[PDB]
User: Fold Spike glycoprotein from Severe acute respiratory syndrome coronavirus 2.
Amino acid sequence: STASALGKLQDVVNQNAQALNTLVKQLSSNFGAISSVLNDILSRLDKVE
Amino acid sequence: DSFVIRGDEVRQIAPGQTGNIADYNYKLPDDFTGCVIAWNSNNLDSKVGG
Assistant:
């Protein structure tokens, strides 16, 4: 009946999931680039730049 | 490597350049090492009749 009695394991799983999710989400960041997609910045631009 | 070029295309002679002579006539390597020297030869390489 009583839930929330298993906080440790649930916390561990949530921590792993959050770390993975934010690692995946980091792909969309720009980091000061012009875009977060390689193909478009490759196509719109030229070689030496 | 020596030749003559139209005046405006002078900056096409560089690694990773795109143009007419840069890709149809003479392409430089991207990791080229060395120097490029450009100067005008109007008084000899030009003709009033062309």
The two ends of chain A are 63 Å apart (CA to CA). Chain A has two helices and no strands. The interface with chain B takes residues 46-48 of chain A (CB under 8 Å).
